Ligand binder design. Sequence first.
Ligand SMILES: Nc1nc2c(ncn2[C@@H]2O[C@H](COP(=O)(O)OP(=O)(O)O)[C@@H](O)[C@H]2O)c(=O)[nH]1
Ligand SMILES: [Mg+2]
Length: 146
Amino acid sequence: SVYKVLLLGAPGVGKSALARIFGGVEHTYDRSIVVDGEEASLMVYDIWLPGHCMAMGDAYVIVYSVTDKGSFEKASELRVQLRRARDVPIILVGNKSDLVRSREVSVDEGRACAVVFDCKFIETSAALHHNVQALFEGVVRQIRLR
Ligand SMILES: Nc1nc2c(ncn2[C@@H]2O[C@H](COP(=O)(O)OP(=O)(O)O)[C@@H](O)[C@H]2O)c(=O)[nH]1
Ligand SMILES: [Mg+2]
């Protein structure tokens, strides 16, 4: 299967950092990955014309930075905007988990946001490559489920 995934979020949260790691780069990315014994190719659009960007993907990844409370609030704005434009899979991502001292958003607040959105939540660190692979395999699983 071939899927389009759009990365949404406030500037500076790590969208491009996460896309490049997935794409294997040091825009858009493609890459086939095997999830649960089945291969799937994901086309990741790191392009966040808001209306135009929101009317495409087969899934959306809303990213905020755990060190930026404002970016977390922006995640809620994006979810509302998305509801006004599109039952497509949404994954909420709290990035920069490695910056422990500068955290501004707790893991609990992230999990609570996910309960409100009724979506999957994961925390990542583009700096350490932690949970990056898990994020995209998760997008594939959520798409198949829907
Ligand atoms: N320490 C740390 N820095 C990160 C992480 N992800 C992104 N950054 C940094 O945050 C800034 C914004 O990164 P960028 O990928 O351009 O975010 P974008 O604007 O959402 O695309 C850069 O200074 C990155 O080096 C992370 O997981 N840990
Ligand atoms: Mg970027």
